[PDB]
Design a protein around this ligand. Sequence first.
Ligand SMILES: [Mg+2]
Ligand SMILES: [Mg+2]
Length: 303
Amino acid sequence: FHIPLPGRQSPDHARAEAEQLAWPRSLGLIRSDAAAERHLRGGYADLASRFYPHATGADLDLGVDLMSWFFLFDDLFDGPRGENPEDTKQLTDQVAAALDGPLPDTAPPIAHGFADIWRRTCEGMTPAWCARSARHWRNYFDGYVDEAESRFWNAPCDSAAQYLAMRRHTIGVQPTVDLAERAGRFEVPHRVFDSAVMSAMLQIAVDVNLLLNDIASLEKEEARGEQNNMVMILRREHGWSKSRSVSHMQNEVRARLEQYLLLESCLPKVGEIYQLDTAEREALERYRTDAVRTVIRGSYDWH
Ligand SMILES: [Mg+2]
Ligand SMILES: [Mg+2]
């Protein structure tokens, strides 16, 4: 890896991988043997075990379930639904409703799956934590509506800045990191979560994932005529070739990873600034190592 973040994987990964189909199957999310085979080919329990190496048993299963759900949910916007913000919001409203209370049994399977994840996610977490993580979920769903609006008007982004304002929410990294707290039964001190230093660290985590994702998905997205990929956007913004745009993105990933270390080195002083007590310093260290560092490296290793 470009910076010395250790590669990690939950020791309980084999069982979580072997049992991963039971949950989406029970919820109606995988409707056939063919769909199950397709799901296993994604390696989503493997991904979860790298984001959540500190989790085992039911806590790791929740992480596997979140990964499974992310990809099954995203599938629902592959076709015409993703081209229309009214149709996209019709679905995302039904899913996001789970944040406000129970769902009617007529709600779509993907909404019931979300509701079950969110129910488990909130267990043992402070009300203030649940409210914040719910806000992150609503940012995510609103981002899906914004993406469908762009597709509807055939209006792809013309700058990296405009693209990032949307993709930083649809990439789903912040809810992934939120789950790492729940999966580890800890909470980073809330005033430090809000800090400028931690905000920058999290933005790096989000950005590194979305940039690597756009490189990994480039050829598939080119074949579908997708225009909201950082490579295509940089070509429009700067006149660059796609080749120079990829190289720019690679340089940006490396530079941001190096900045991540710098920001990490500020955390001792940040803890002093916010007068963290002993338990709070321990919780911040769990967040740094088990939530932020893991999400930065987990997707890289998964590919
Ligand atoms: Mg898909
Ligand atoms: Mg899509």
